[PDB]
């Protein structure tokens, strides 16, 4: 990438830019996700991909740079949120209750003071509906609402 080094002299210097890995097993895709057979094969667990696709301060890169499709760009967005709040990204800081699979920001969720009757119960959302299309290695499907 490039860096803006200032000291008053200020300059922009390009340093240490990577490239593709030597082989994609399924080339001729449009996105790296579609090119490495990861269309429906990641989660919030794996912070390898999620570490690749983010800025060093926890933000993402725009889709015009990474070349992702819209579907898995939104999926990577939600997985960044789910992995940051679960505490899986401790080195991408701006400068205590344990969680995982947190869809919404924990600062702006109202408690369910009155859950409804058995036919109108207000459920607790777990996981995200963007990851609904994952590969189903479980006999019963994901329960996204608890």
């Amino acid at each position: 990438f490039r860096e803006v080094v200032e000291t008053t002299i200020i300059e922009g210097r390009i340093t240490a830019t990577p490239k593709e890995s030597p082989n994609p097993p399924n080339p001729s895709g449009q996105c790296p996700i579609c090119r490495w057979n990861l269309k429906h094969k990641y989660n919030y667990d794996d912070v390898l991909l999620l570490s690749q696709f983010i800025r060093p301060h926890g933000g993402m890169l725009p889709r015009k740079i990474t070349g992702l499709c819209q579907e898995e760009h939104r999926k990577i967005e939600e997985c960044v949120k789910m992995a940051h709040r679960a505490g899986l990204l401790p080195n991408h800081r701006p400068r205590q209750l344990n969680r995982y699979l947190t869809r919404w920001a924990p600062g702006s969720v109202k408690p369910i003071y009155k859950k409804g009757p058995r036919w109108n119960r207000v459920r607790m959302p777990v996981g995200s509906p963007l990851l609904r299309d994952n590969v189903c290695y479980s006999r019963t499907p994901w329960k996204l609402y608890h």
């Binding site: 001729s28 895709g29 449009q30 996105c31 579609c34 269309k39 499709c69 819209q70 579907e71």
Partner: protein, 157 residues
């Protein structure tokens, strides 16, 4: 309860099982398709006649002038036979590549103003472009030879 009610009437449970079983299942594609791979001719003719019209070309940086200021500069440039021309650069690159302008390709991008003429009077444009402390005279080309800005000064002198 009548069969036509103001509110939605609750179906008998067998009928609701029918409405659930018979529900429309849309076809799932195997691979998702998003992840699968006269005016322009008039401009071609016009800037072509411009290109075999002029002998030397100078270009400028004109979006940074007011409406009244562009009116005045048009006024003091009207006393000459020179014409001004601005047009999009995404069609100007085919014009530069078509006129074998290899050394004019990395010159005409962004906001630029063309100053087509056939005889030298760039001296008084230098005079009136020291009167405003901006808007440099960009590099041009006389008879397939690139004119730099120091070349513009030498050609003016």
């Amino acid at each position: 309860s009548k069969a036509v009610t103001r509110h939605r009437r609750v179906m008998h449970f067998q009928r609701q099982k029918l409405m659930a079983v018979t529900e429309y299942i849309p076809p799932k594609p195997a691979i998702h398709p998003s992840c699968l791979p006269g005016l322009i001719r008039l401009l071609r003719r016009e800037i072509a006649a411009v290109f075999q019209d002029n002998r030397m070309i100078a270009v400028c940086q004109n979006v940074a002038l007011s409406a009244e200021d562009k009116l005045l500069m048009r006024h003091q440039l009207r006393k000459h036979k020179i014409l001004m021309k601005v047009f999009p650069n995404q069609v100007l690159k085919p014009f530069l590549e078509d006129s074998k302008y290899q050394n004019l390709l990395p010159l005409f991008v962004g906001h630029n103003m063309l100053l087509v003429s056939e005889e030298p009077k760039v001296k008084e444009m230098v005079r009136i472009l020291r009167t405003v402390p901006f808007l440099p005279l960009l590099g041009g080309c006389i008879d397939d030879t690139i004119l730099s800005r120091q070349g513009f000064i030498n050609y003016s002198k």
